[PDB]
């Protein structure tokens, strides 16, 4: 339709923003513990999928918790300590989150450049309708 | 009459595009006020009803925020660009149609 380009770019921007927000939240909760109701904090990731309308935009179905084992730290003085006196610290890969943020920023800038070019082309298109 | 009927659809499309532009401007200007809900209108249904005040409905939130605001900047910007381009196209179509109607008189 020559106008689904805007939809594709907007979906890409929204997905990149979601992924960046997830990475930022993980970085903020890198060294947290004992969230609400006492359950240990676990990191989360996002999964990108394409919308087969062929070629289509990107979407994020749901946020998936990481299955990597939590860090078990010996500290009996914490009420969260089990019979072995261990507390469950969250699994956060700082380098992984930095790389994810870098990738999200680069994809966002590429998509905004594509939007700029297509907007210029579409503005120039209407000059022939007169 | 006939002259008004030939242009009613394009004129109403232009007017609805202007109103939706105003709605988008308002809900992008209120991007920081907590407790403010995003607003927009169903363009196709509105145009069909008017061709046969203005009804507006809330937007589905994208991500939660503690303050309460539910406006997404990139989505609003894309909608703004789309509506602006479609308004420009409608204006061009109306101008061409009027130019042809004027030209037929010579």
């Amino acid at each position: 339709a020559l106008l689904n380009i805007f939809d594709i770019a907007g979906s890409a921007l929204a997905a990149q923003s979601k992924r960046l927000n997830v990475a930022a939240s993980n970085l903020a909760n890198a060294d947290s513990v004992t969230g609400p109701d006492g359950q240990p904090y676990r990191a989360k990731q996002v999964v990108f999928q394409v919308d087969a309308a062929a070629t289509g935009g990107v979407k994020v179905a749901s946020v998936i918790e990481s299955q990597a084992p939590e860090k078990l730290v010996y500290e009996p003085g914490n009420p969260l300590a089990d019979a072995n006196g261990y507390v469950k610290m969250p699994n956060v890969d700082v380098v992984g989150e930095m790389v994810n943020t870098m990738s999200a920023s680069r994809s966002y800038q590429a998509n905004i450049e594509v939007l700029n070019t297509v907007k210029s082309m579409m503005l120039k298109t209407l000059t022939l309708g007169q | 009459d006939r002259l008004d009927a030939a242009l009613r659809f394009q004129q109403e499309a232009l007017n609805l595009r202007a109103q939706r532009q105003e709605i988008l401007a308002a809900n992008i200007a209120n991007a920081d006020t907590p407790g403010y809900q995003a607003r927009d209108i169903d363009f196709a249904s509105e145009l069909k009803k008017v061709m046969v005040a203005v009804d507006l409905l809330y937007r589905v939130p994208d991500q939660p925020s503690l303050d309460g605001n539910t406006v997404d900047m990139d989505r609003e910007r894309t909608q703004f660009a789309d509506n602006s381009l479609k308004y420009q196209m409608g204006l061009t179509v109306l101008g061409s149609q009027l130019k042809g109607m004027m030209n037929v008189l010579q």
């Binding site: - | 309460g68 997404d72 989505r75």
Partner: peptide, 21 residues
């Protein structure tokens, strides 16, 4: 449903409980 669509009713207000009630 899908984010960014049109809904006739507002979403419930957001809250961030520090501790569960």
């Amino acid at each position: 449903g899908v984010p960014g669509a049109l809904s006739n009713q507002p979403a419930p207000p957001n809250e961030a409980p520090i501790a569960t009630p």
